[PDB]
């Protein structure tokens, strides 16, 4: 069981690499664009096994999963993906940058997961 996480505004897929960088890219069929969620709050890259992660400065990255709540995420019915620790929401732009920001209701902060 793995899902893609697609930005509602740009259509680009959340994606990450073994270096820990998180970004969005047009869908390319690769496993780096699939994510698993064991049900402990984590969103884990299907290819690298690293956990989606972010800090209070709004940086998003992956790290090996370490049990901290920076690596826990809440999926809302409106498509927000909120960081448990910071309460900021996963966000991205047309150029492929991924970050978190306080929720502003706009579509860049909305994601389709499936
Ligand atoms: O050939 C490597 C890799 O390329 C494509 O994936 C891109 C991106 O989605 C991945 O996050 C990064 C990981 O470093 O690589 C590319 O930039 C896909 O074709 C993928 O299947 C392939 O393994
Ligand atoms: O001790 C700080 C922090 O360490 C670990 O969290 C790491 C990472 O997952 C976090 O995203 C960033 C946020 O700045 O900090 C570390 O690099 C965890 O042990 C965490 O619970 C702890 O607060
Ligand atoms: O007015 C532009 C844009 O501003 C607000 O969104 C911000 C951020 O959430 C987006 O990721 C980036 C993407 O370029 O833009 C802003 O920093 C929202 O109000 C959004 O509805 C609006 O288009």
UniProtKB/Swiss-Prot annotation:
Coiled coil ranges (UniProt) are: none
What top-level branch of life does the organism fall under?
Bacteria
Extract the GO molecular function terms from the UniProt entry. carbohydrate binding
What are the start and end residues of each sequence repeat?
1-38, 39-76, 77-114
* Known outcome of mutating residue 109 to A: Complete loss of HIV fusion inhibition
Alphabetized UniProt keyword annotations: Antiviral protein, Lectin, Repeat, Signal
Q: Where is this region: 3 X 38 AA tandem repeats?
A: 1-114
One Gene Ontology term of the biological-process aspect is:
regulation of defense response to virus
Limits of the Ricin B-type lectin domain = 1-114
Quaternary state and interactors: Interacts with HIV gp120 and SIV gp130.
Miscellaneous notes: Anti-HIV protein that inhibits virus membrane fusion.
**What's the protein here called?**
Actinohivin
Ranked from the top, the taxonomy reads:
Bacteria, Bacillati, Actinomycetota, Actinomycetes, Actinomycetales
Q: Coverage of the whole protein, first to last residue?
A: 47 to 160 of 160
């Amino acid at each position: 069981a793995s899902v893609t996480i697609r930005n509602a505004q740009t259509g680009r897929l959340l994606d990450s690499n073994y270096n820990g960088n998180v970004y969005t890219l047009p869908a390319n069929g690769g496993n780096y664009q699939r994510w698993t969620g064991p049900g402990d709050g984590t969103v884990r890259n299907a290819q690298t096994g690293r956990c989606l992660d972010s800090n209070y400065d709004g940086a998003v990255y992956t790290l090996p999963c370490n049990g901290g709540s920076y690596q826990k995420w809440l999926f809302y019915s409106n498509g927000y993906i909120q960081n448990v620790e910071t309460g900021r929401v996963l966000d991205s732009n047309y150029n492929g940058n991924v970050y978190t920001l306080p929720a502003n209701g706009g579509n860049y902060q909305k994601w389709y997961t499936g």
